[PDB]
Amino acid sequence: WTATSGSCKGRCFELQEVGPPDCRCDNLCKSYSSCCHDFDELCLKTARGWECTKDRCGEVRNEENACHCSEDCLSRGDCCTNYQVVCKGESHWVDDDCEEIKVPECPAGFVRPPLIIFSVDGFRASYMKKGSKVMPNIEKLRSCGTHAPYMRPVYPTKTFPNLYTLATGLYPESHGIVGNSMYDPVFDASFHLRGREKFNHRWWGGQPLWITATKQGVRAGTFFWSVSIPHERRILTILQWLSLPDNERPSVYAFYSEQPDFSGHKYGPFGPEMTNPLREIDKTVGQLMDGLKQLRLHRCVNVIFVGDHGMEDVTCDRTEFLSNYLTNVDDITLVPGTLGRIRAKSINNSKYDPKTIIAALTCKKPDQHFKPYMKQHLPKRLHYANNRRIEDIHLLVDRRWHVARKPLDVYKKFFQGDHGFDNKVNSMQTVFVGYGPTFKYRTKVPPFENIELYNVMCDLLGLKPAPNNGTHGSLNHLLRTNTFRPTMPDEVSRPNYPGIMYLQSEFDLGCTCDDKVENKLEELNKRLHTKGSTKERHLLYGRPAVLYRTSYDILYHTDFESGYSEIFLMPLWTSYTISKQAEVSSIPEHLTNCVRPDVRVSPGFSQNCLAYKNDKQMSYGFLFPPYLSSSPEAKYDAFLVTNMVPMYPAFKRVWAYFQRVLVKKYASERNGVNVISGPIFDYNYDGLRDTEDEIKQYVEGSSIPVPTHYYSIITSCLDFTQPADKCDGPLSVSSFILPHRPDNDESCNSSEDESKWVEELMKMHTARVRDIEHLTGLDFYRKTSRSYSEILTLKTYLHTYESE
Ligand X SMILES: *[C@@H]1O[C@H](CO)[C@@H](O[C@@H]2O[C@H](CO)[C@@H](O[C@@H]3O[C@H](CO[C@H]4O[C@H](CO)[C@@H](O)[C@H](O[C@H]5O[C@H](CO)[C@@H](O)[C@H](O)[C@@H]5O[C@H]5O[C@H](CO)[C@@H](O)[C@H](O)[C@@H]5O)[C@@H]4O)[C@@H](O)[C@H](O[C@H]4O[C@H](CO)[C@@H](O)[C@H](O)[C@@H]4O[C@H]4O[C@H](CO)[C@@H](O)[C@H](O)[C@@H]4O)[C@@H]3O)[C@H](O)[C@H]2NC(C)=O)[C@H](O)[C@H]1NC(C)=O
Ligand Y SMILES: O=C(Cn1cnc2ccc(N3CCN(C(=O)C4CCCC4)CC3)cc2c1=O)NCc1ccc(Cl)c(Cl)c1
Catalytic residue set = 159
Between helix 159-168 and helix 453-461 the angle, nearest 10°, is 40
- Using CB under 6 A as the binding rule, whether residue 163 contacts ligand Y is answered as yes
* CA separation for the pair 539, 783 (Å, rounded): 10
688 touches Ca ion (CB under 5 A): yes
Q: What gap in Å lies between CA 518 and CA 92, rounded to an integer?
A: 86
| Nearest-approach distance from CB 256 to ligand X, in angstroms | 22
684 binds Ca ion (CB under 5 A): yes
Task: Work out what residue 534 binds among Zn ion, Na ion, ligand X, none; the CB cut-off runs from 5 to 8 Å by kind.
Answer: none
Q: Can you tell me the distance from the alpha carbon of 527 to that of 558, in angstroms, rounded to the nearest whole number?
A: 10
Q: Is 231 assigned to a binding site?
A: no
Is residue 308 annotated as involved in ligand binding? yes
The size of the interface with Zn ion (CB under 5 A), counted in residues, is 1
Residue among 167, 182, 461, 623 that touches ligand Y (CB under 6 A): 167
CA distances to 534, 561, 601, 673 from 501, rounded to whole Å, are 22, 19, 7, 33
Among 609, 608, 645, 610, smallest CA distance to 625 is for: 645
Name the minimum Å distance from CB 706 to Na ion: 12
Q: What is the DSSP secondary structure assignment for residue 604, as one 8-state letter?
A: G
**465 counts as binding ligand X under rule CB under 6 A:** no
Longest CA–CA span in the chain (Å) reads 106
Residue 175 in the binding site for ligand X (CB under 6 A): yes
Residue nearest to Zn ion (CB): 261
Q: Which of 181, 226, 533, 579 binds ligand Y (CB under 6 A)?
A: 226
Chosen residue from 139, 261, 282, 391 binding Zn ion by CB under 5 A: 261
CB of 163 to Ca ion, least distance (A): 7
Nearest one of 773, 322, 785, 315 to 542, comparing CA atoms: 785
Which residue in the set 26, 38, 121, 790 belongs to the binding site for Ca ion (CB under 5 A)? 121
CB of 493 to ligand X, least distance (A): 17
CA distance 233 to 66: 8
| Among positions 27, 84, 126, 159, the unique one binding Ca ion when judged by CB under 5 A | 159
Check if the beta carbon of residue 455 is closer than 8 Å to that of residue 467: no
CB 404 within 8 A of CB 319: yes
Q: Does 201 bind ligand Y (CB under 6 A)?
A: yes
- Collapse the DSSP code of 150 into the 3-class scheme (helix H, G, I; strand E, B; otherwise coil) and give the result: coil
Considering only the stretches 157-165, 462-470, 601-609, 745-753, report the one whose residues sit in contact with ligand Y under the rule CB under 6 A.
Answer: 157-165
The answer to whether the annotation marks 682 as part of a ligand binding site is yes
Nearer to Ca ion, 567 or 748 (CB): 567
User: Torsions phi, psi of 649, nearest 5?
Assistant: -55, -35
User: Is 765 part of any known ligand binding site?
Assistant: no
Binding site partner of 261, from Na ion, Zn ion, ligand X, none, Cβ cut-off 5-8 A by kind: Zn ion
688 is in an annotated binding site: yes
Nearest distance from C-beta of residue 223 to Ca ion, angstroms: 14
Q: Which is nearer to Zn ion, 261 or 312 (CB)?
A: 261
* 8 A C-beta contact, residue 583 and residue 627: no
Does 206 bind ligand X (CB under 6 A)? Our answer is yes
Q: Find the shortest distance in angstroms from Cβ 175 to ligand X.
A: 5
Q: Using CB under 5 A, which of 391, 598, 690, 771 touches Ca ion?
A: 690
Q: Which of 470, 387, 449, 451 is nearest to 686 (CA)?
A: 387
How far, in Å, are 147, 310, 399 from residue 427 at the CA level? 18, 6, 8
User: Is residue 467 involved in binding ligand X (CB under 6 A)?
Assistant: yes
For residue 28, state whether it binds ligand Y (rule: CB under 6 A).
yes
Give dist(CA 176, CA 191) in Å, integer: 11
CA 379 from chain center: how many Å?
12
3-class DSSP state of 785: coil
615 binds Zn ion (CB under 5 A): no
309 is in an annotated binding site: yes
Q: Does 198 bind ligand X (CB under 6 A)?
A: no
Among 223, 435, 448, 556, binds ligand Y (CB under 6 A): 223
Task: Give the binding-site size for ligand Y (rule: CB under 6 A).
Answer: 16
Q: Per the annotation, does 686 bind a ligand?
A: yes
Q: Which of 15, 211, 688, 695 binds ligand X (CB under 6 A)?
A: 688
Among 232, 398, 682, 746, binds Ca ion (CB under 5 A): 682
Task: Tell me: does residue 612 bind Na ion (CB under 5 A).
Answer: yes
Amino acid at 370: F
| Count of C-beta atoms within a 10 Å radius of residue 525 | 13
**Element holding 520 (H helix, E strand):** helix 520-530
Q: Has 180 been labeled as part of a binding site?
A: yes
- Residues 601, 332: Cα–Cα separation, whole Å: 53
Strand-pairing partners, residue 449, are 152
Q: Are 483 and 455 in contact (CB under 8 A)?
A: no
Chain length of the chain:
804
Report whether 407 contacts 316 (CB < 8 A). no
Per-residue binder mask for Ca ion (CB under 5 A), 640-679, x = binder: ----------------------------------------
Determine if 376 is a binding residue for ligand X (CB under 6 A): no
Crossing angle (nearest 10°) for helices 275-294 and 136-144 = 60
| 323 interacts with, out of Na ion, Ca ion, Zn ion, none, CB within 5 to 8 A per kind | none
Interatomic CA distance for residues 649 and 403, integer angstroms: 33
**To 10 degrees, the CA torsion angle through 420, 421, 424, 428?**
-50
Burial class (CB in 10 A: 0-12, 13-18, 19+), 414: exposed
Q: Does 744 bind Na ion (CB under 5 A)?
A: yes
Amino acid residing at 174: S
**Which one of 265-273, 307-315, 474-482, 737-745 is the stretch in contact with Ca ion (CB under 5 A)?**
307-315
Min dist. Cβ of residue 360 to Na ion (A): 15
CB of 744 to Na ion, least distance (A): 4
CA dist 543 and 553 (Å) reads 12
Q: Which residues between 381 and 400 bind ligand X (CB under 6 A)?
A: 383, 386-387
Instruction: Give the helix ranges, DSSP H, for 295-423.
Output: 354-361, 408-411
Q: How far apart are CA 127 and CA 134, in angstroms?
A: 10
Out of ligand Y, Na ion, Zn ion, none, what residue 612 binds, judged by CB under 5 to 8 A for its kind, is Na ion
Nearer to ligand Y, 82 or 207 (CB): 207
Residues making up the binding site for 1-hexadecanoyl-sn-glycero-3-phosphate: 159, 180, 261, 419
- Positions touching ligand Y (CB under 6 A) are 28, 31, 160, 163-164, 167, 198-199, 201, 204, 208, 223-226, 256
Residues making up the binding site for Zn(2+): 121, 159, 261, 265, 308-309, 419
- Positions touching Ca ion (CB under 5 A) are 121, 159, 261, 308, 682, 684, 686, 688, 690
- Positions touching ligand X (CB under 6 A) are 170-171, 173-176, 205-206, 383, 386-387, 467-469, 686-688, 774
Residues making up the binding site: 121, 159, 180, 261, 265, 308-309, 419, 682, 684, 686, 688, 690
